[PDB]
């Protein structure tokens, strides 16, 4: 019976995204279940349909709306209905497929994509990578405006690519990371519109891996480095968890809680 | 339902002739980028000039570089172009990219919307 968060890109203030962001973490994760600082998603395994999903309701100064489907466990997308039509992606499994079957139910069209919604996925169909593809509140605005036309027809497919690939970046990696959401929170403040840089990007490579680094970790310090990239390109090493806290909001549940 | 795109202008030309094009967008905001195509009938769409929302910088395609010039207005966009060749002889085409790095795009893959289109002939 999933929990919804309405936003507008109508006239969003800096104030009125982190208020977004701030908010759907919350109908996101379990409230207290964190490794060495930082919050852990509800565990796939043990999840009850019911609870499996959240929904995001996304307007326009352009007046027109499309509601998202997000996997608790994930953070991720799975799919969205505009009005009377709804699409999802492939499935990776058995499991995932049925938990689908719950999102929109009173929907007439339900479709269902062959393909992944994987980055490389998208990037492939969009045509282009993540870095020349423009992030920021006019671009989301142009975005939701083309998910609905798609429902519609009026856009064609890479269009449609590059606008997954810019929400659920926006919302999913905004969510993922404050680093993210107050990337996007200057990138509204002073009204840019541009690309990821390479620090951002690295970040929604890694978040799987850095989920496991961490839970992992001995008391926060990490079995293993892990390479990232500075806004500049230049490449380090992560050795421990301290400094990732400032970053990242959310990790995917990995491993049962240490004693 | 989307965008909905639109481009006058299109006719006849002696080749050496010139030729001006315009098009209007129709609830449309950010942009980034607009640029024009031109199709042969049974050939692709060759990339033709662009320019670039946001700063206005002017990019052209090969062939076409030094005879056609691109503008921005408001709404509305312009391509002219002088001293037709023959060869120039094909459908031309309005885009409204809205997403890629302004610079980075010009393939038809790149633009979102299209316009419908308007035809230039020649000697």
């Known amino acids: 019976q999933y929990p919804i968060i309405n936003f507008t890109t109508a006239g969003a203030t800096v104030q009125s995204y982190t208020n977004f962001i701030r908010a759907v973490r919350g109908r996101l994760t379990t409230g207290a279940d964190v490794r060495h600082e930082i919050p852990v998603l509800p565990n796939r395994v043990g999840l009850p349909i019911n609870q499996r999903f959240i929904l995001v309701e996304l307007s326009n100064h352009?007046?027109?709306?499309?509601?998202?489907?997000?996997?608790?466990?994930?953070?991720?997308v799975v799919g969205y209905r505009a009005g009377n039509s709804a699409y999802f992606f492939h499935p990776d499994n058995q499991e995932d497929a049925e938990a689908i079957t719950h999102l929109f139910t009173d929907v007439q069209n339900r479709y269902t994509f062959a393909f992944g919604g994987n980055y490389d996925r998208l990037e492939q169909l969009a045509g282009n990578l993540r870095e020349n593809i423009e992030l920021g509140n006019g671009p989301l605005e142009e975005a939701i405006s083309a998910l609905y036309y798609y429902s519609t027809g009026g856009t064609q497919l890479p269009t449609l690519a590059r606008s997954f690939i810019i929400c659920i970046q926006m919302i999913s990696e905004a969510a993922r990371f404050q680093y993210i959401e107050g990337e996007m929170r200057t990138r509204i403040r002073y009204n840019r519109r541009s690309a990821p840089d390479p620090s951002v990007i690295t970040l929604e490579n890694?978040?799987?891996?850095?989920?496991?680094?961490?839970?992992?970790?001995?008391?926060?310090?990490?079995?293993?480095?892990?390479?990232?990239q500075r806004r500049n390109g230049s490449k380090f090493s992560v050795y421990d968890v301290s400094i990732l806290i400032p970053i990242i909001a959310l990790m995917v549940y990995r491993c049962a809680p240490p004693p | 339902?989307?965008?909905?795109?639109?481009?006058?202008?299109?006719?006849?030309?002696?080749?050496?002739?010139?030729?001006?094009?315009?098009?209007?967008?129709?609830?449309?905001?950010?942009?980034?980028?607009?640029?024009?195509?031109r199709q042969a009938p049974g050939k692709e769409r060759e990339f033709v000039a662009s320019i670039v929302w946001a700063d206005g910088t002017t990019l052209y395609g090969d062939s076409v570089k030094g005879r056609f010039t691109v503008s921005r207005d408001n709404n509305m966009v312009y391509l002219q172009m002088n001293n037709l060749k023959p060869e120039d002889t094909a459908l031309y085409y309005?885009?409204?990219?809205?997403?890629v790095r302004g610079l980075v795009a010009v393939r038809a893959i790149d633009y979102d919307y299209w316009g419908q289109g308007t035809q230039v002939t020649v000697s």
């Open chain 1, 62 to 76: 352009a007046e027109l709306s499309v509601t998202l489907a997000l996997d608790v466990t994930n953070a991720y």
């Open chain 2, 94 to 99: 309005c885009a409204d990219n809205k997403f």
């Open chain 2, 1 to 37: 339902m989307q965008v909905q795109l639109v481009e006058s202008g299109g006719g006849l030309v002696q080749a050496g002739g010139s030729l001006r094009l315009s098009c209007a967008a129709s609830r449309t905001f950010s942009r980034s980028s607009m640029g024009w195509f």
């Open chain 1, 206 to 228: 890694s978040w799987g891996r850095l989920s496991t680094a961490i839970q992992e970790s001995n008391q926060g310090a990490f079995a293993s480095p892990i390479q990232l």
